[PDB]
Structures are given as structure tokens and as C-alpha cells.
């Protein structure tokens, strides 16, 4: 018999993104080639099958630095990290291939699905 | 020119609640009288003006235990912690006074607003 506040989840994610932009309580650095991205492990896990697996591992859960596969493009990762914290995906003709490949690696099934749909249309 | 995934924020919050239920990456214990509640500092901050102030403090940000004011009712806190992680508020005749008082203390303005509305109706 609960009541529900429709905007609560969106407001929580907006505040988590504000914490990220201000580098507050970030507990991990994701290294993608020469580029570094600070984030919250919990948000990464909530969005990605890959980060979920990494941070539930009894040894990796304690690492402050995670290095991604050298094939991963920093821009594709940046676009996906922004999506994790906002629900908004900056999908463009020039980045769609790198975004799909990064989403497949990160195990972000809904992003992979829309990339496959957008590629099929063109 | 981004696209948006409507269910993303709700799915993120659902996964954060699953992490909470399994005690994964919880980094704080909230003590309310004899009762203890494990949670994620970032989620508490995203939902509460009080926790936002506590964990942005250069000294308190590093505490693993936070003791609430002894006037705070453990059931009211439990109901509010559940709301933080689900968007669902278990508001009942027998708990509304304790929920409103706890929400005022935690600075959860939308919960305070619905409690004031529900009390006014009766």
C-alpha cells in the first residue's frame, strides 16, 4: 500500500551526476588509453555488467584504479559514462561504431540495442 | 541532440537497492537508537539535505558510523531509507507523524510535503 514519487529516481541520478561533476565521494579512476575518468563504483555497477562483475570480485572491489582494454576508445567511454549519470546518449554518425563497441565491452545491453537499431536504419 | 532511455534512472535505483539488500559497497552505518542501518553515502546525499551536509564536511565525509538525534524513531528512518532506494513511501496512519518528523530532520522536502497533505486531509 505504498505511494510513489514519480520524479524520485531521476532526481537521485541528477544529484549523483552533480556529485560526479564536483568530484565528491568518487572512489575509482577508470583509465582508457591516456585518459582518466573519475566515478562512483556503485553507479558504474548499476549501469554496466562489466563493472558489476569487477566490483563484486573480492580482490578488484578494493582497487582505486581500473584499466580498460587498449582497444577501448576514450570518447566512446566518455559518452557512455555521461549516459550512466544522465540517461542521455550522445549518439552521432561519427561516434556510433565506437559507442556500440564500448557498450558491448561494458555490457550495457539497452545501449547496444539502440546502436544496432540506428546502424540498421542507415 | 542526445536520445534518452526513459527507464534508465529507475533501473539504476533498482540496482542500487539490490546492492543495498546484499550489503555490497555499503560504506556507512546509520545508528538510530539501538538500530543500525547500512547504506551508500552517495545515495543518502542524493536523497537528504542532512546527509548531503554531513558527507560534504571535510571531517564527517570520512566517518563509517553516523549517530542520529535520539528523538529519531528507527521505524520512521527505515521507511525513509526504503523510500530513498525505491521511490516508494510506506505512509500509514500509525506511522505518518514519525515519518514527517524524520523527513523534516533528514531534510527530504517532497516527503514532508506529502505528509503535510495527508495529515491535512484527516
Amino acid at each position: 500500500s505504498c505511494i510513489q514519487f514519480t520524479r524520485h529516481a531521476s532526481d537521485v541520478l541528477l544529484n549523483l551526476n552533480r556529485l560526479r561533476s564536483r568530484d565528491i565521494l568518487t572512489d575509482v579512476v577508470i583509465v582508457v588509453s591516456r585518459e582518466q575518468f573519475r566515478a562512483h563504483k556503485t553507479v558504474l555497477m548499476a549501469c554496466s555488467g562489466l563493472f558489476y562483475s569487477i566490483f563484486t570480485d573480492q580482490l578488484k572491489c578494493n582497487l582505486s584504479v581500473i584499466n580498460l582494454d587498449p582497444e577501448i576508445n576514450p570518447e566512446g567511454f566518455c559518452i557512455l559514462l555521461d549516459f550512466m549519470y544522465t540517461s542521455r546518449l550522445n549518439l552521432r554518425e561519427g561516434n556510433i561504431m565506437a559507442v556500440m563497441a564500448t557498450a558491448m565491452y561494458l555490457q550495457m545491453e539497452h545501449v547496444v540495442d539502440t546502436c544496432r537499431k540506428f546502424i540498421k536504419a542507415s | 541532440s542526445c536520445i534518452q532511455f526513459t527507464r534508465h534512472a529507475s533501473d539504476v535505483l533498482l540496482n542500487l537497492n539490490r546492492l543495498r539488500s546484499r550489503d555490497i559497497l555499503t560504506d556507512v552505518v546509520i545508528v538510530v537508537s539501538r538500530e543500525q542501518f547500512r547504506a551508500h553515502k552517495t545515495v543518502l546525499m542524493a536523497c537528504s539535505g542532512l546527509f548531503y551536509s554531513i558527507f560534504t564536511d571535510q571531517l564527517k565525509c570520512n566517518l563509517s558510523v553516523i549517530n542520529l538525534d535520539p528523538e529519531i524513531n528507527p521505524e520512521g528512518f527505515c521507511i525513509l531509507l526504503d523510500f530513498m532506494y525505491t521511490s516508494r513511501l510506506n505512509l500509514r496512519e500509525g506511522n505518518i507523524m514519525a515519518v514527517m518528523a524524520t523527513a523534516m530532520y533528514l531534510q527530504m522536502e517532497h516527503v514532508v510535503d506529502t505528509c503535510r497533505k495527508f495529515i491535512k486531509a484527516s
Binding site: 505504498c2 505511494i3 510513489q4 514519487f5 514519480t6 | 516508494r88 513511501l89 506529502t114
Partner: peptide, 4 residues
Amino acid sequence: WVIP
């Protein structure tokens, strides 16, 4: 607020 809604009835979910």
C-alpha cells in the same frame, strides 16, 4: 505522488 501516485498509486504505483
